[PDB]
Design a protein around this nucleic acid. Sequence first.
DNA 1: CTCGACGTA
DNA 2: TACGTCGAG
Lengths: 188, 189
Amino acid sequence: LKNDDFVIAKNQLGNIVPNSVGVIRAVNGKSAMVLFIGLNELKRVDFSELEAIDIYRTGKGYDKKICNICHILKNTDGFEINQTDAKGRKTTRPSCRECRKNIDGVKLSSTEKKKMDEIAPPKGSVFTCPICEKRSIVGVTANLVHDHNHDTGWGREWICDSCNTGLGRFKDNPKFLEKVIEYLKKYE
Amino acid sequence: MLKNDDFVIAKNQLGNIVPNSVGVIRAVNGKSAMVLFIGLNELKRVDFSELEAIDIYRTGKGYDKKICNICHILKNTDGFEINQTDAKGRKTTRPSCRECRKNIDGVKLSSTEKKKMDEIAPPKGSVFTCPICEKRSIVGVTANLVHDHNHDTGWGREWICDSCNTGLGRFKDNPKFLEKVIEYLKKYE
DNA sequence: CTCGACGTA
DNA sequence: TACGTCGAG
Ligand code: NA
Ligand code: NA
Ligand code: NA
Ligand SMILES: [Zn+2]
Ligand SMILES: [Zn+2]
Ligand SMILES: [Zn+2]
Ligand SMILES: [Zn+2]
């Protein structure tokens, strides 16, 4: 084992479950200091409790994949199929089904969905997105969606799919949106 | 013949409105209509002879012509850049035409700014923490990184994840729209 | 040309 | 299952 190499935990290590991926940060004769990426825990682990892994033989094309949140090595079927590439191969979400539970949160409720459906822009109407302010023809030059708050399950507004999928990149969280603002202003 | 809510194109130049500009009929008066031309958001009185009805559902993917999502001019499919492929193997073009993409793309990252960013590039297979979303990742394995740049100046910003980069673009790299997002979210918290 | 990623339908 | 969309590679 060398510094910068990747390993998995062979067994439960305190808070660290087996198959948790870590990077070697220091080595001595019998142990490594390992940063387990999911929990951001740096631990002294005996070599006998670690197994080297080839990170480039994980993910698309392979039988196992490292989750981008928990950074645990899991079977491919532990991740939801989400897209298809130009070669016809299926792409799964980068976060495993367990981690997706926290991301997805509470679904839009039936009664909130009905409230939104009562005021839905008709297909083929001219719509202006309340966020990005772009005009579109509904279902022709932009697709619209029922946005909802995933902490409460309550509806928000009809918005374009582009904006909705943008919100998700920043975790529907004003904290990260404020970080984006500061970042952009720094390089104005 | 023409009805309110029908879609038309300008056959010819109508003041500021170029041919093939898509409009929606907003009022009808004998044989003239008040047409909202969507690209420029201009409401104009137009004689029926200057308009051609179009079927918006026989435009876009699968068809010869497509309406641009910015200028809302009806253009040939090749006026839009191929960008993706769907599950059925069909090619998807960007919703904005090549002309409108010029203004979205702005100034490209300069060669010296690129070389500069390349000298501080996170190594492939290193553990990286995105400066925007704060998510830890393994470079090129659990997240892909990109050279982000300011498209007003052509200068580099930072190495960020592709997810964040493509989020910035959805809001036009413009703090104005990010502020709108904040107030929208706050409103429903 | 090709890419993954998001919350949706 | 699948979708378009973004700045990228
Ligand atoms: Na590989
Ligand atoms: Na949403
Ligand atoms: Na960018
Ligand atoms: Zn996970
Ligand atoms: Zn929008
Ligand atoms: Zn255009
Ligand atoms: Zn990020």
